[PDB]
């Protein structure tokens, strides 16, 4: 019924650049988006929740802005420490979260 | 200040019975939702299983059957049990905890292979 | 497998008198030298029957079976074979099939798919039905069989009984009197409202001989029967203002659903039965058609706003977060739930935070119970005194509304009507 | 009035009556089956030693007089219904069940048998093996089959199939949970309808043969009909279909006994 997809697949950029990674949704989700990181061989970590707020302990680098469909993550400076994957989480009334593909950032 | 431990990995034949353990540290599993997630090599996360805080469990269309979850409050350890598995079902498994519409707690995993 | 015929000739039907036809034994009892009166479906004297002649001529029309039929047919060389009784004559209904071949007589009822023109054709061709899949009742009976032969048949369908009447005797319709003894009683228990006959065609091709049969109607009339010593028959003679709860601008909270009690009026369900915007009419226990007939002693109304997901999840066979920690339906529910889209309103420029619902609870919630979610929630070993900690927080959450959601991801105006049974007198019955 | 004269019609091998009872797969309430049972032993007395009835109310027939009446026509039916609607089987009762699926006529003779089903017909999942009818434009004739698959019409707008609001499915399933409730527990109902008509008996109970005695004023029992009188042959001839006769005063004066097949005038 619902499926998540991501147009970018592998974007390479320097520290002073914008990755411009977004997640495409067929229907509109209102401020219920979260972005995670997948480190190869390491446990995942939290970045944001509900696409408007910031989780405690997360450095102020990952942000987001979007009402229902167009969500784009903005990074002021691309640190070398957080080089992992990106995933978009959207849910209906029940807690049925949906995940799409992963985007890899390389030097 | 939250951590999770998992046990039960090993060698399991296809179409067999395997039991998984997830002991929460510092949290009581009877007052919050349990979450399961998979990370396949070269793939991403997707729904596995979520246990409610009460006596009910939610499954997807493909995993509607063959699954039976009976948590134990004596040791605060989550239990996952299945009776049949396929060749495409092997990856790393994580038990997780979180609030509504987003999950926070994570941990390590146990790897199982079939042939 | 059927073959259409295009050589049929159209002629107006003819009529024949029915002086002394349509008399049978009222019951299996026997009486002698005594006059007895019965109230049963007979054929009144000096009635009107329709003259059908077969000779090419292949008049096989279809007539409705309003009441019992009297079948009189002068017969030679075994022209007619049987009759078809059925409502619509298709696989959607059960229809009879009577055929008497060269060996025996079989009575089979199934979902026979009769073609436009069913007939029969030594005889080795039977084009009557295509196939059947779900039928059980099958019966096999003994063979019942210048012109010199006449047959009389009377078929009645009362109390789910199919009684056939047969009489064989040697000989326009001749004038005379004869008996008609019952032969076979069969409890088919099926609805019959139309009938048609069967004609057999002999190849040379498809030739029909000189045969004729009569179709008559039966009417209730008392008759007198006279017997003798030999044991034979000789001769016979204040409305509720529902617009307030169905057109209110604002509703209550999801968790704090409003409780209302309105009574002392009549139930005019046809007012909201013909409304345009609503499309959900799910009901359990009591059918909506009967709902305007029976009397209910309790009427309850609920006022809350929620999307169609909870409208579909209100059934007790499925659970959910709201269905387990906020509001659940009792297993013995007999009411109905009505919801409709309200996308024209309740959508401002910014999000709306006026509706909240519960998320976490220790156990299940008893139905139709009022609960206030204002205390802090604890999950770890150490509780908090209202502190928004890592494990301790407020279960309540806000709502986000935009005009660009999916097909079913929109809030709906939901009203719940519940019916209860009690020994108290009903305050609303109309 | 010392002893009888003739015996009841000859008995044969006992019918497989254990097939209709103790069943594992019961038919639907609307798709009930019919079968013919004849020419065998009437053994309804063992049903008391079988599982208890608790719904053995009958109208017009005694519960323990079935041995001596020997009804000639049987009608075995398989019904499924909940425990709340077991009291709706009585005739002259309205309701959706008693007007859309099956109803009892006023002149009905006999009674039905129902019993609890707590041990079987229940599992962890819902039992969706039985369906009923809820919507029709007309009522029911007594003892009339009703197999419907066409969609119901609700309004002037035609419906090709299922609709959200315009039309509804006429068939609905059953929800039989183990903890649903005792009042909603499904009950298996079997129908045993009689005729109470003087007919040539083809099935009867196991009785004792009696030698024929004539010209004696002793009592007799002809197919459950009692009386006193003398037996004497006459010159009247009866049709093979006809069995007995009646006079002007509606008093039986003749009977057709099995096997021997003589006149045996009552008085
Ligand atoms: C029978 O009906 C036809 C027309 O339907 C009429 O012409 C004829 O006179 C009628 N016969 C009798 C005996 O009433
Ligand atoms: C003839 O009828 C008997 C029973 O009436 C049936 O068993 C048999 O199959 C029929 N034969 C043909 C050729 O239709
Ligand atoms: C009717 O027959 C079809 C086979 O053509 C079968 O699939 C279906 O289940 C049957 N229906 C009933 C009620 O037996
Ligand atoms: C009645 O039967 C007797 C012999 O039993 C016979 O002589 C007489 O002709 C019969 N009556 C008629 C009207 O045939
Ligand atoms: C509610 O209002 C609409 C139009 O505003 C009207 O068509 C409808 O009949 C009203 N509801 C009732 C119950 O009168
Ligand atoms: C029916 O089943 C019960 C189960 O215990 C059994 O006792 C009884 O004998 C059975 N009925 C017959 C006629 O065998
Ligand atoms: C039998 O069919 C007729 C014609 O369609 C209909 O009017 C009548 O209501 C039906 N009877 C039953 C009991 O369904």
Residue numbers in the entry:
A (entry chain L): 1 to 107
B (entry chain H): 1 to 115
C (entry chain C): 14 to 68, 77 to 142, 153 to 176, 185 to 210, 215 to 247, 257 to 289, 334 to 526
D (entry chain A): 322 to 588
List passages from the publication reporting this PDB structure.
SARS-CoV-2 Omicron variants feature highly mutated spike proteins with extraordinary abilities in evading antibodies isolated earlier in the pandemic. Investigation of memory B cells from patients primarily with breakthrough infections with the Delta variant enables isolation of a number of neutralizing antibodies cross-reactive to heterologous variants of concern (VOCs) including Omicron variants (BA.1-BA.4). YB9-258 and YB13-292 demonstrate best cross-neutralization abilities towards VOCs, including the Omicron BA.1 variant. RBD substitutions in Kappa (L452R, E484Q) and Lambda (L452Q, F490S) variants abolish YB13-292 binding. To understand neutralizing activities of cross-neutralizing antibodies identified by our activity assays we determined the cryo-EM structures of the most potent YB9-258 and YB13-292 antibodies in complex with various spikes proteins.
Although we used molar excess of YB9-258 Fab at high spike concentration (3.1 mg/ml, 22 µM protomer) during sample preparation, we only observed Omicron BA.1 spikes bound by 1 or 2 Fabs. Analysis of these structures suggests that interactions between “up”–“down” RBDs likely hinder opening of the third RBD contributing to absence of 3:3 protomer:Fab complex in the cryo-EM sample. We noted that similar interactions between “up”–“down” RBDs were observed when Omicron BA.1 spike bound to ACE2.
